[PDB]
């Protein structure tokens, strides 16, 4: 009934979306029909009005902040609690892989000696933890893997996992669900058409996880499995400690329903959100929203006042995710981005604007921190846990495939030295820990199945010397 | 003669160098003779003997953190900044400050690193930006004490760069400086030497040579009489700095006033090291004497050691920015330099075999010896350390086989723009959309901003060009004023 739809669009001020209906082959016009019939126009106008209608900080109290380095007298207790939580099948992990090289970032092969993709590395960190848990508690156990993907990448991501046999995990325990979308809209409040037959659409931000969880009953799935803790994380960090027993133990022990892992920000303009509290309410002030004066404040000790860098690693309990889906979600606000958005004009010409065209609305995953009953912050070291792959080209600065590769290999290289091993050149001369910039860097990779975080390596490496590239995996020690 | 040389080579066991002598054209024979002639074979044998001991069969155990009593900070002590800076500008006005650039190293994208063009909207090379900061300080000190003044630029070159460099300055009219004040001198060299202690020929007529390390600065000063040229100019302070740092604050008045005000003969500028494996030397004290333990000579356990406050115990990263008083140099050049030791590196050295065949080994076959410039800190009457922030003063441009995602031309470009972008927001300025929507300080596009040292040395004096004005990047602010490249 397209008479019914022309009418509801025109009342919403969007009849221009059918401007070319008569120029579309029957196939075309049914793709557009079903795409429009699936939009909540009343709601999009409300969202637009609040977005358009749009237009002091304090560090968290030391009482809520734990440190992997300063509270090392506690790492053991925390690690035991997380492995214990894992062995009880009480822990699940949720990967934010929406909004993706026009391919899923988890497929990125960084040039590691073993050529593993980010998806595989993550899967093996999950397999490892299941195995360490069993070794320490005796029972077989499961850490389910919830993967939120975008429409464009759902099928391709699934095929990729089938091709790789789920990296050794069971399909039964990997749950794929997709993120929602939102249309781009010009400054006049009209939805933008990408083509004569397609609305310019984009993922609703990683904060669209909440509406996505709801739409596919993911929480009920977690409840059915009896999961208590969810480790939410970003796909681009090759160093990500998936289901990290320490971070989780910490949160369980401090009785939190919500936690965020953090690293110290030292460069005032590093594009990292900053965890803090405003009017007693916890949140992240996204880097694109801090003033330079604040980003630059320093405390007595010489460091930045706002130095708790969000590395997009959160802990959420299931009942809390339950409250968010059932109550808080509608209260989250859209963060706005003015963008140059390709569009078909009224004259049927395809335009690539040079002046920002309209806005993109996104919800942020960390905006539910303000609703948590008990929020904690966990600080870790950068070199051990955070090396984001943000831009594939090495000409956008850092955070590219080659910095991620060296970040992982440098870490593994240090695990070997700390476990008593050494690297040598062709004559058997020992290389130093940081060899001169050719007056290699050392190629080293250790499978997560062998070492989750540097432990269990003495029997393979103590007092031994290796010629890089060195890989230590399930099949032993190999110098390529 | 040749039996002169020939005999010297035999006492030395370096006879094989004339192996191809009777097979060289007159031109070739003169090139080699000259090369061999400028070499101290008996000494080289002694250096090799000392360098090779480094393999036999421990500084780390004796290393101690820099004590608080010698450490000054641009952050923790900003209240003393105005004083240090005017003190520094005073020395510059008094004509008592010279700058010395270490540029005998190479670069390969094969040419002087100083000649690199990083993609800045102005396109200036590192050499130019430095000369402009030197020009700047001269205008500022004049327009602050009333007299014209000079910051002489001594530039240590190597057999590699010398020619290329000189021609480049001449081509650019010394960027506005006066050539009588840009003193080029040449660094010495050392031959590659195999493990058996034999000097390596790279051609039948060419000894395989390389610059003797930035520490080769000291014999270099004595050879070309540089210390005397400095004394004849009435220079008291010398700012020694690395060529590859695009943010380098040449003849930095604050750093200079700090050391002079604290009465030092020697000072090092450092930045906080946070990553254990960052390749920067670390300033430290060993047996009551200051040293820099180079990144390649520290153990991982030391590099990773933390202090109670959570930062690296050895966090004073060396940025190759030093302060030496001319008298201290005096003593170094003619009293202490013989105690400097060579740091060694095993290398794969292309060589010519006994039958004339050029070979490229797949295994290291010899060593390279180098002296390091900071190894004189230990001889100082009073050593001082001055901590400064990375983003304002340190963004190294290293060789391609030493970047690995960073410390490259593009990160160097991003560091100068980010700094200038920030200097602008701090002076009340703002950047905007094509629609004029004001951009955040850190948009989610790398805001291209470039301010000339002539307009601003460290972010000062921009209020007029910038307070309360919005700008369209890319933005360039130079002598000819404010420019928007659209
Ligand atoms: C909103 C948010 O989290 N911002 C954080 C994110 O910012 P940043 O802006 O860098 O990254 P993005 O929010 O765009 O993306 C981060 C993660 O979110 C996912 N994603 C993104 C958009 C989307 O619609 N759907 C989706 O699932 C990506 O797959 C990725 O896993 O990482 C930084 C660390 O590197 C943190 O310091 C920032 O505070
Ligand atoms: C010996 C030395 O200074 N090491 C420092 C240098 O090491 P790094 O390894 O970076 O560099 P190099 O020791 O090769 O020397 C860098 C500087 O020295 C010059 N040069 C080098 C060799 C030579 O024979 N002649 C010469 O003039 C180069 O032109 C450049 O100006 O910079 C780092 C900062 O990035 C510091 O943390 C290191 O402690």
Curated annotation (Swiss-Prot), chain B:
The keyword Acyltransferase does not apply. Pfam families: UDPGP. Changing residue 444 to A: Decreased interaction with IRF3, leading to decreased pyrophosphorylation of IRF3. UDP-N-acetyl-alpha-D-galactosamine 1 binds at residues 102, 104-105, 187, 213-214, 242-243, 281, 294-295, 318, 398. One of its GO terms (cellular component) is plasma membrane. CDD domains: UDPGlcNAc_PPase (cd04193). GO terms for molecular function: identical protein binding; protein serine pyrophosphorylase activity; UDP-N-acetylgalactosamine diphosphorylase activity; UDP-N-acetylglucosamine diphosphorylase activity. Keywords: Cytoplasm, Immunity, Innate immunity, Nucleotidyltransferase, Transferase. Widely expressed. Expressed at low level in placenta, muscle and liver. It is found in: Cytoplasm, Cytosol. Pathway: Nucleotide-sugar biosynthesis; UDP-N-acetyl-alpha-D-glucosamine biosynthesis; UDP-N-acetyl-alpha-D-glucosamine from N-acetyl-alpha-D-glucosamine 1-phosphate: step 1/1. Monomer and homodimer. PANTHER family: UDP- GLUCOSE PYROPHOSPHORYLASE (PTHR11952), UDP-N-ACETYLHEXOSAMINE PYROPHOSPHORYLASE (PTHR11952:SF4). Catalyzes the last step in biosynthesis of uridine diphosphate-N-acetylglucosamine (UDP-GlcNAc) by converting UTP and glucosamine 1-phosphate (GlcNAc-1-P) to the sugar nucleotide. Also converts UTP and galactosamine 1-phosphate (GalNAc-1-P) into uridine diphosphate-N-acetylgalactosamine (UDP-GalNAc). This is UDP-N-acetylhexosamine pyrophosphorylase. It comes from Homo sapiens.
